[PDB]
Protein backbone atom coordinates (compact mmCIF):
# COMPACT_ATOMS: atom_id res chain seq x y z
CA UNK A 1 0.00 0.00 0.00
CA UNK A 2 0.95 3.50 -0.96
CA UNK A 3 -1.59 5.11 1.75
CA UNK A 4 -0.32 8.75 0.07
CA UNK A 5 -2.84 7.67 -3.35
CA UNK A 6 -5.78 6.70 -1.30
CA UNK A 7 -6.21 10.76 -0.70
CA UNK A 8 -9.10 12.59 -2.15
CA UNK A 9 -12.67 12.47 -2.31
CA UNK A 10 -14.61 9.30 -2.01
CA UNK A 11 -17.75 8.16 -1.94
CA UNK A 12 -19.95 5.66 0.46
CA UNK A 13 -21.21 2.22 -1.32
CA UNK A 14 -21.39 -0.85 0.72
CA UNK A 15 -21.59 -0.73 4.56
CA UNK A 16 -21.22 -4.18 6.55
CA UNK A 17 -20.97 -5.10 9.85
CA UNK A 18 -21.44 -8.37 12.12
CA UNK A 19 -23.69 -5.69 14.46
CA UNK A 20 -26.00 -5.16 11.79
CA UNK A 21 -27.68 -2.51 14.46
CA UNK A 22 -25.08 -0.14 13.78
CA UNK A 23 -24.67 0.31 10.42
CA UNK A 24 -28.94 0.53 10.14
CA UNK A 25 -30.96 3.55 9.70
CA UNK A 26 -30.05 5.14 12.99
CA UNK A 27 -26.82 3.23 14.18
CA UNK A 28 -23.59 5.62 14.74
CA UNK A 29 -21.95 3.92 12.16
CA UNK A 30 -23.85 4.66 9.34
CA UNK A 31 -21.96 7.52 7.98
CA UNK A 32 -21.35 8.75 4.53
CA UNK A 33 -17.82 9.56 3.46
CA UNK A 34 -16.65 12.73 1.62
CA UNK A 35 -13.20 12.66 1.59
CA UNK A 36 -9.81 11.24 3.41
CA UNK A 37 -6.87 13.76 3.98
CA UNK A 38 -3.22 11.51 4.26
CA UNK A 39 -1.16 13.12 6.62
CA UNK A 40 2.41 12.19 7.73
CA UNK A 41 0.91 10.30 11.08
CA UNK A 42 -2.85 10.19 10.29
CA UNK A 43 -5.90 10.04 7.73
CA UNK A 44 -8.34 12.83 8.64
CA UNK A 45 -12.30 11.82 7.32
CA UNK A 46 -15.00 13.87 6.55
CA UNK A 47 -18.21 12.13 6.60
CA UNK A 48 -21.67 13.41 6.50
CA UNK A 49 -24.43 11.02 8.37
CA UNK A 50 -28.16 11.55 8.90
CA UNK A 51 -29.68 12.29 12.33
CA UNK A 52 -33.39 12.97 12.64
CA UNK A 53 -33.67 13.26 9.02
CA UNK A 54 -31.47 16.16 8.05
CA UNK A 55 -27.47 15.91 6.89
CA UNK A 56 -25.04 16.53 9.37
CA UNK A 57 -20.94 16.51 9.17
CA UNK A 58 -18.46 14.48 10.96
CA UNK A 59 -15.00 15.18 11.18
CA UNK A 60 -12.59 12.45 12.36
CA UNK A 61 -8.70 12.14 12.71
CA UNK A 62 -7.17 8.11 12.66
CA UNK A 63 -3.59 8.09 13.51
CA UNK A 64 -1.30 5.56 13.01
CA UNK A 65 -1.06 2.49 15.73
CA UNK A 66 2.71 0.56 16.62
CA UNK A 67 1.31 -2.02 14.22
CA UNK A 68 1.94 -0.90 10.51
CA UNK A 69 -1.16 -0.36 8.48
CA UNK A 70 -3.16 -0.27 11.32
CA UNK A 71 -5.09 3.15 12.61
CA UNK A 72 -7.27 4.37 16.11
CA UNK A 73 -9.46 6.82 16.47
CA UNK A 74 -12.16 7.58 19.44
CA UNK A 75 -15.71 7.15 17.95
CA UNK A 76 -18.36 5.10 19.91
CA UNK A 77 -15.73 3.43 21.70
CA UNK A 78 -12.01 2.76 20.66
CA UNK A 79 -11.81 1.47 16.83
CA UNK A 80 -8.70 0.25 15.13
CA UNK A 81 -8.76 -0.15 11.03
CA UNK A 82 -6.84 -1.46 8.55
CA UNK A 83 -6.87 -0.93 4.41
CA UNK A 84 -7.59 -4.33 2.97
CA UNK A 85 -7.66 -3.52 -0.82
CA UNK A 86 -7.37 -1.10 -3.26
CA UNK A 87 -6.70 0.16 -6.99
CA UNK A 88 -6.86 3.86 -6.00
CA UNK A 89 -8.30 5.58 -8.61
CA UNK A 90 -11.87 2.96 -8.05
CA UNK A 91 -12.32 1.22 -4.68
CA UNK A 92 -11.00 1.20 -1.21
CA UNK A 93 -12.33 -1.85 1.22
CA UNK A 94 -11.79 -0.78 5.18
CA UNK A 95 -11.72 -3.13 7.99
CA UNK A 96 -12.40 -1.86 11.43
CA UNK A 97 -12.50 -3.16 14.87
CA UNK A 98 -14.70 -1.39 17.73
CA UNK A 99 -14.76 -2.19 21.19
CA UNK A 100 -16.64 -0.47 23.53
CA UNK A 101 -17.92 -1.97 27.17
CA UNK A 102 -15.98 -4.83 26.97
CA UNK A 103 -17.50 -6.00 23.26
CA UNK A 104 -16.60 -5.51 19.95
CA UNK A 105 -17.84 -5.80 16.77
CA UNK A 106 -16.09 -5.54 12.77
CA UNK A 107 -17.24 -3.15 10.40
CA UNK A 108 -16.31 -3.55 6.62
CA UNK A 109 -16.38 -0.34 4.09
CA UNK A 110 -16.13 -0.31 0.19
CA UNK A 111 -15.69 3.43 -0.95
CA UNK A 112 -15.65 4.60 -4.61
CA UNK A 113 -14.19 7.53 -6.48
CA UNK A 114 -17.89 7.63 -7.91
CA UNK A 115 -21.03 7.39 -6.06
CA UNK A 116 -21.30 3.33 -7.71
CA UNK A 117 -19.15 0.68 -8.32
CA UNK A 118 -20.29 -1.86 -10.55
CA UNK A 119 -21.54 -4.94 -9.19
CA UNK A 120 -18.01 -7.65 -9.70
CA UNK A 121 -16.32 -4.97 -7.51
CA UNK A 122 -19.58 -5.47 -5.14
CA UNK A 123 -19.37 -9.14 -5.10
CA UNK A 124 -15.71 -9.38 -4.41
CA UNK A 125 -16.67 -7.19 -1.52
CA UNK A 126 -19.43 -9.00 -0.19
CA UNK A 127 -17.52 -12.63 -0.87
CA UNK A 128 -14.30 -10.98 1.50
CA UNK A 129 -17.11 -10.06 4.30
CA UNK A 130 -18.37 -13.63 4.29
CA UNK A 131 -14.87 -14.62 4.73
CA UNK A 132 -14.50 -12.18 7.83
CA UNK A 133 -17.99 -13.96 9.08
CA UNK A 134 -20.63 -11.04 8.05
CA UNK A 135 -23.13 -12.98 6.48
CA UNK A 136 -24.94 -11.08 3.39
CA UNK A 137 -27.79 -9.97 5.48
CA UNK A 138 -25.41 -7.51 7.32
CA UNK A 139 -24.07 -5.78 4.18
CA UNK A 140 -26.04 -2.82 3.07
CA UNK A 141 -26.10 -1.21 -0.31
CA UNK A 142 -25.83 2.16 0.55
CA UNK A 143 -26.73 3.38 -3.25
CA UNK A 144 -30.50 3.14 -1.95
CA UNK A 145 -30.25 4.94 0.67
CA UNK A 146 -29.99 8.33 1.74
CA UNK A 147 -26.15 9.16 1.88
CA UNK A 148 -26.37 12.79 2.38
CA UNK A 149 -25.40 13.25 -1.66
CA UNK A 150 -26.89 16.98 -1.52
CA UNK A 151 -24.87 17.97 1.12
CA UNK A 152 -21.50 16.85 -0.31
C1 LIG B 1 -12.40 3.55 7.98
C2 LIG B 1 -13.82 3.37 8.48
C3 LIG B 1 -14.38 4.62 9.00
C4 LIG B 1 -15.68 4.11 9.64
C5 LIG B 1 -16.64 4.99 10.33
C6 LIG B 1 -16.12 5.96 11.38
C7 LIG B 1 -15.42 5.20 12.42
C8 LIG B 1 -17.96 4.45 10.71
O1 LIG B 1 -18.63 3.82 9.50
CL1 LIG C 1 -28.46 10.53 -1.46
Do not use: P
Not at 69 to 84: A, H, Q, R
Not at 87 to 102: P, R
Not at 121 to 145: M, P, Q, Y
Request: charged content about 30%.
Amino acid sequence: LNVEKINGEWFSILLASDKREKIEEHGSMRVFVEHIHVLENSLAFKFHTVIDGECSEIFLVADKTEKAGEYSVMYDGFNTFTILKTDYDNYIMFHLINEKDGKTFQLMELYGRKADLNSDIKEKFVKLCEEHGIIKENIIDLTKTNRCLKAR
